[PDB]
Design a binder for this molecule. Structure first.
Ligand SMILES: [Cl-]
Lengths: 882, 882
């Protein structure tokens, strides 16, 4: 029996895998598609969705004279229509395109690139992240009229003539530049092209040809062909203006434009937390077929497509509150359109609550292949702003139309009620191919910060900064933390970089300064280069200051836990509290106190760096700093290393009052000759750069040296220290160190370690007690180790200290070694009186600004994304006439 | 308990049925698409699948110097490629296109219209029947380079310049002309437009967007632009010739061409019983994305697109025996394709049995946006003839390719084994968009005659007949009956029509005659007009011959059954078998035998006419003929009409040997004056036409008249008859007639009836015994009734008799009456000694040939469709240079 209950179990589990399977399929097959980003270029200086909505709800009329710049033949009868302010302007370099090829490029190809990039940004992607993805591209292109014919083109531009004007390339070139690998195609269906495209993408996503899709359309009138052809037979308003459904309809008005939508499976966008601007729910495409003429509309067909659309959307006619009509202001067409609406959407109505109707063609003109994409944007923007804008140029309603179904003449309201709101959008093509799609409102959702920003060039970076300032200012509801998070995780990191750190008041001013070419406190600025090989430097004396990370101790957890781990390890070997010591901001005179403290702080600073994704490919230490570098490398346990520095320093107390040390701005030879005269009383303690050396020995013999030097313009800094290491005075302590350092467990390490003691880079199992005596006795030789790393192809040096002290030496050593103005950089961590996170973020910012890979995320826990301005294209005009 | 027992019983049942539904949704979703017809226009004078194959397996090289006639600027280096014989030739009239519009039309549009028609004809449709259907149009168009610009176009062709070159219109114009209502769009993917289109079409079908779809692509190089662009960049073979995969590869060879497929859901085409040529099993489209360069192909993507295509087909790489590689002979591209095939298909084979590879581009060149339609056609054809044709120009295999997977270099053969054979066909776009599709062999399928045919002009009709004769002569496996059926039910009925009746040998000879402008027996030829009103004419004496219907009684059930029904109605009134009378070919001397049989024959012939969908709108009788007419028009039951004619004829025996009748060739008044001298001894019995009358009276006085005419040369024909009806001698009969014709029950009739007794049209309830005596006593006046039908706009007179006796008179009347040469046709039925079904079909033919609606179906019982020649287009050259 029991087996034939567990037999039920798995038999029921098959049966369940299958039912939910069938739903999945069927659900997927009609799944709503989310419009997740947009971007446009319309008449009226429209370059954003924000601008489009301003222009339209504002009741803008864009119709005007055709620009002079195109090299059009003059005409007695001025050419009126909806033109694009800067149709020939393009940032070619951004896209890897030579000036020569950009010149042979159909403006329609160019614009598409720009806006495709913009739209993915607004969708929440760093578009570079999408290279190699299966993203689709579906573009509606009607006419191309840009080039001269191959047969009369300048020889300069001949390679790029065909490819630069071929309709297929409007699609493909987007795929080739953003490295997309889904299907890419250009669709021609005249006016409805734009929706044909959109429909094709929806179906592509529903079948899984891709996860993501770019659906758009473009028309740019490079020549006055259309004017000529329409001024031939009838159709153009003398006004240049579209008066949809009015008494006063003359004919349509020619225009140009471009629009894109990032489309994604609704469920997929929810899972990834992308913003849903609106949902497309179903669409349909048909032909009017046997009409009265090739270019005649046919209402019966228009009706048929409204129904197929609604069948597909799974929506009822009466549920749609508004329609974005074709509405071209034609004498034949407007009536036909309205009658087809009346007997579809209107049949299912009260008089008491009619269908509402508009046309953006009253604002921007007949934008042709883009018209439709133009209509879907208006519809989306209307669903997001709760308002139906004015349809311009409405005399009286047209007396050719037999009027459920009204036109919106004064701007109306459209608020979120019980039902979702939806809109239909239609565009009907001159060649007979009609399209209608159904749009729904989006369904329901829900200290200091480093702001990181980039430009392909220096001016772009500065534009980036200014627009971020404007955005932040005109939008105090936006979290600073989400703004930084988005900037860090969802924007491309270009060559010229800036990092502005601080709270909101500071974040604003830092950005405005970056914009105006100035630098505010805590800003990092640089040019990135690929960096492979982070060497962490670990210095010794001269890196302490009375505060030392009082603030960082409070403001960072990674740092404070590291420290805790230290106070625990040094507990046995030392009798004072690390924390009381740092938190208190207590004096740091004693050797037996300073050195282990510096050890903890520097190890703790290393932990922070690693938590922000910066890992050492090698480590170099300096005197005491080799203990930290040894631990960080992995050659020592914290317990070992802690004991080591605690013991070293306890013993070193024995030399107290018997010598001093001082740094001098000269070379080993210079110093070697000068010092030779005191036979043995002084020794060179370290050589840190071609013109920097420490000398150690008996004070008096030292003072004569310090005195003599200042009297000849030599750098000669007392180190505030009462002993003299790296000198023959250390033979006294040889016994005691070998005695109670014994029991140390060195291990070969993951990371390279370039010994200063030895002079070579080493297997770190070498570092027995015998080694550690030598580190205190023998001369340091940091200059030597620097060169070895330089020569070994390290390009990034991070001086992991509370104050930079070897930084300057290092750069001088790299002047003398690396190919001048090729590469390597040097970067510190904290600085005197500059502890606390913000200043660590500024040190990250410097490393990052020069091309170190940093993981910024730890500075933004939680932190959803947020909508930011778009890349500021550095444009130039390219235009080839006829 | 058995509780759980019951539940395993349930669960299994729902497991099973849930899996049936899931199975059925998933099948539908990706069901095989059938290629059910195809047409084309390729280099080497290829204009049909058959001529394509002949060309290709003959190892044909179409490469040649471009035609001089396109207005191309001559050039020092001659332009070699695959050029379309006559790209400028179009039948504009067939499609209702003006010469002015045709001139400004891109030839890519024109060629598409023609072959879309041809393809539908081959798929076994009358394209006309598809008007208003949901058939979609998907068309690969790359470049369009035809016109001058609207700036510089002759003002003569100006209103048609934009429409004539719009890419979208290649798709749309087809749907406009054929009246198709599916989604119609154009696609630009450069060289893979072809397959892309077919892929979109495959999916539209699978989404039930349409039931049928035309998928194709075109390129016509109207200008030398491409030659110009590629002679700057490198890449063209100096040869003109693609040598795919050979050491000899210089570059590709520009070419042009055009191809369509009629696609349909496989289940549906089986359901509709339609030739499945091959089957599209699966496809894919992708982008090679971040390649080396826009135009550079990329192996990884080529492999990806193959594997996606295979997945969708549900086919293993191992299961595919041939691939139509893109193979354009490019030095860079060829190796990349062969490597990508090697690691997809050639991974899954042991060397022993490799994948075979070819490229038609070696025969016809790189046919650009049509290439790949060209490819799928070669594969479909190869599957059908079981042969892999030779890939030309194969010097040696390329030493740059790293050779599972071999190039077919000598014509291998491909037999239908235990596996279904399949092919892949790839084509790769210069903008980086790739397609691959998978094609499977077609699955398991299993007297004299009237041939009808037509053309929009006379030349087309004759050409149509020539093509039929050839087709019938060359392919004897196609039944004549099936051929007749297809012509009648699957071909449009154009203005100029011919009908040929015969067994096969005589159908050939008649067909060949019509083709030569000659005539044969059982061959009718006409110009059709819509004819509003068939008037059936029923004559009297003269129409009989001794055979009458013996043949037709055996060959026609509709007829034999009607004769059976009469025999039954006459039996009470007459003591001789109608059947034995007609079957035994027995003499018809006596009045009481003739008149009833002639009625029974004439009434059953009417039945035939009606069984082929010819209804009288009006009828006319001539003496006894009125009886038939009255019954046919449904004023008298068969039982009444039978009684009437039996009695009327029996009583008429009383005048035997007392007079006579004879038809004279002269008009009423000419007869009247010539006859009046025998005061009353002769009567004008009937006036039938303006120069034909019948005279009844006392023989003697009648012999004098006849003698007096043969003296002066008048048509003077003795009617082989004992008596003199329609004369005073009929008073003797009045009483007996009225006495036993009483009881007759006439009623108002459905159909009109233009009484020859009265002189008018009538209410047929009128036709009581008083009327019927008048019908015998009175002058007939057929001419007055003829004109009354003319004057009331009947245009089609059918003489429903066994021998045409009134036919010539009617025609002399309608000269007078109707506008001289506005239309009218006068048709007989059978002829003396030409009874028999086939002669009836010939009568039907003369009526069909002139525009009477005939329903031919009854001639073919058990007839299946059969493939036939396509419309012979009547073409002119239209070409606008630059
Ligand atoms: Cl200090």
């Amino acid at each position: 029996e029991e087996k034939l209950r567990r037999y039920l179990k798995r038999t029921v589990t098959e049966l369940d895998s299958v039912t939910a399977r069938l739903r999945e399929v069927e659900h997927r097959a009609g799944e709503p598609i989310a419009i997740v980003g947009m971007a446009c270029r319309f008449p009226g200086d429209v370059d954003s969705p924000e601008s489009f909505w301003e222009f339209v709800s504002g009741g803008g009329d864009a119709i005007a004279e055709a620009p002079a710049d195109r090299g059009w033949e003059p005409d007695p009868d001025a050419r009126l229509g909806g033109m694009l302010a800067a149709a020939g302007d393009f940032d070619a370099g951004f896209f890897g395109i030579s000036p020569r090829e950009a010149l042979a490029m159909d403006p329609q190809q160019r614009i598409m690139l720009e806006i495709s990039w913009e739209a993915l940004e607004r969708a929440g992607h760093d578009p570079v992240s999408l290279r190699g993805s299966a993203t689709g591209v579906f573009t509606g292109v009607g006419t191309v009229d840009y080039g001269p014919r191959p047969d009369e083109a300048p020889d300069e531009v001949l390679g790029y003539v065909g490819t630069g004007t071929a309709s297929s390339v409007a699609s493909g070139r987007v795929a080739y530049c953003l490295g997309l690998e889904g299907p890419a195609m250009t669709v021609d269906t005249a006016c409805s092209s734009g929706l044909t495209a959109l429909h094709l993408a929806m179906e592509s996503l529903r079948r899984d040809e891709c996860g993501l899709a770019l659906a758009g359309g473009v028309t740019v009138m490079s020549s006055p062909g259309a004017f000529t052809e329409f001024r031939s037979q009838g159709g153009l308003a003398a006004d240049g203006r579209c008066k949809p459904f009015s008494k006063a309809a003359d004919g349509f008005g020619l225009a140009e434009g471009a629009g894109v939508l990032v489309l994604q499976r609704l469920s997929a966008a929810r899972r990834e937390g992308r913003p849903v601007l609106a949902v497309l729910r179903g669409s349909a495409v048909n032909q009017d077929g046997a009409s009265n003429g090739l270019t005649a509309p046919s209402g019966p067909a228009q009706q048929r497509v409204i129904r197929r659309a609604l069948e597909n959307a799974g929506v009822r006619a009466g549920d749609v509150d508004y329609v974005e009509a074709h509405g071209t202001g034609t004498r034949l067409g407007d009536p036909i359109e309205v009658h087809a609406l009346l007997s579809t959407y209107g049949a299912e109505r009260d008089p008491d609550d009619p269908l509402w109707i508009g046309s953006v063609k009253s604002n921007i003109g007949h934008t042709q292949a883009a018209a439709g994409v133009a209509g879907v944007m208006k519809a989306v923007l209307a669903l997001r702003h709760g308002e139906m804008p004015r349809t311009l140029h409405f005399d009286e309603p047209s007396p050719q139309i037999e009027w459920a179904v009204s036109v919106v003449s004064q701007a109306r309201s459209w608020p979120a009620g019980e039902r979702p709101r939806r809109a239909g959008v239609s565009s009907f093509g001159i060649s007979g191919t009609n399209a209608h799609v159904i749009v729904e409102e989006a369904p329901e959702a829900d200290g200091p910060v480093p702001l990181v920003l980039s430009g392909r060039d220096e001016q772009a970076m500065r534009a980036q900064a200014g627009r971020l300032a404007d955005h932040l200012a005109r939008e105090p509801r936006n979290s600073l933390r989400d703004t930084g998070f988005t900037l860090a995780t969802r924007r491309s990191a270009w060559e010229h970089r800036a990092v502005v750190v601080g709270d909101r008041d500071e974040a604003l001013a830092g950005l405005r300064a970056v914009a105006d070419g100035r630098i505010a406190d805590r800003t990092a600025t640089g040019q990135a280069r690929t960096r492979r090989g982070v060497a962490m430097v670990f210095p010794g004396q001269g890196a302490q200051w009375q505060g030392m990370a009082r603030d960082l101790l409070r403001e960072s957890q990674v740092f404070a836990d590291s420290i805790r781990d230290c106070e625990r390890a040094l507990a046995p070997h030392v009798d004072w509290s690390l924390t009381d010591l740092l938190s208190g901001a207590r004096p740091l005179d004693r050797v037996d106190v300073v050195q282990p403290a510096l050890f903890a702080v520097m190890v703790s600073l290393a932990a922070l760096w690693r938590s922000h994704g910066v890992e050492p490919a090698a480590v170099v230490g300096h005197s005491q700093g080799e203990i930290a570098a040894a631990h960080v490398a992995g050659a020592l346990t914290l317990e070992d290393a802690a004991k080591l520095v605690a013991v070293r320093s306890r013993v070193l107390r024995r030399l107290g009052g018997q010598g001093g040390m001082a740094s001098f701005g000269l070379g080993t030879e210079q110093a070697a000759e000068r010092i030779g005269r005191f036979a043995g009383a002084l020794s060179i303690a370290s050589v840190n750069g071609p013109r920097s050396v420490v000398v150690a020995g008996e004070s008096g013999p030292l003072d004569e040296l310090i005195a003599e030097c200042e009297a000849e313009a030599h750098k000669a800094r007392r180190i505030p220290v009462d002993y003299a290491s790296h000198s023959p005075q250390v033979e006294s302590l040889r016994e005691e160190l070998l005695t109670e350092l014994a029991g140390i467990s060195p291990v070969s390490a993951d990371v390279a370690l370039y010994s200063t003691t030895t002079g070579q880079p080493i297997d770190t199992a070498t570092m027995d007690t015998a080694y550690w005596y030598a580190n205190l006795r023998e001369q340091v030789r940091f200059q030597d180790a620097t060169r070895q790393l330089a020569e070994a192809g390290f390009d990034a040096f991070v001086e992991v200290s509370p104050h930079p002290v070897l930084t300057v030496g290092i750069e001088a050593t790299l002047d003398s070694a690396l190919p001048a103005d090729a590469g390597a950089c040097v970067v510190g961590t904290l600085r005197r009186d500059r502890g606390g996170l913000a200043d660590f973020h500024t040190a990250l910012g410097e490393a990052y600004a020069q091309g170190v890979e940093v993981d910024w995320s730890p500075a933004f826990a939680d932190a959803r994304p947020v909508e930011l301005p778009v890349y500021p294209f550095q444009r130039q005009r390219y235009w080839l006439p006829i």
